[PDB]
Design a protein around this ligand. Sequence first.
Ligand code: NA
Ligand code: NA
Length: 140
Amino acid sequence: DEQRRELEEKIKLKLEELKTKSEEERKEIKLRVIAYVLVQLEDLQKRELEEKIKAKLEELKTKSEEERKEIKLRVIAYVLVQLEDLQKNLSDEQRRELEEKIKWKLEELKTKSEEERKEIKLRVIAYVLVQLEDLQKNLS
Ligand code: NA
Ligand code: NA
């Protein structure tokens, strides 16, 4: 699967670059990823999708804390690859429109409690996982 291997190589490089960043930078990058996925979930924010997400959330809660941390890092690396690929397809003005939407979701995030923010991040991770498994079935 040339597509699957190329994607896994892109995720690997982003993981390696993410690990070399400071604790402070890692946090900012993680929050940007949450905010971007939130921008992408706006469309349906009020099927099947929420049933698929909820299944995945329930699956994630049976895992160890250490496995959920590794999953979280992979998700972040994957969204960084998708965000980079998305930006290549935008004009300068579309890129600035997207940054405005991301920043607005980031400010929205800051107003939440730690407990609500933890729930939002887990849901963002579940959605990303469902998308990627729904995606991996069309790569070769
Ligand atoms: Na550090
Ligand atoms: Na998965």
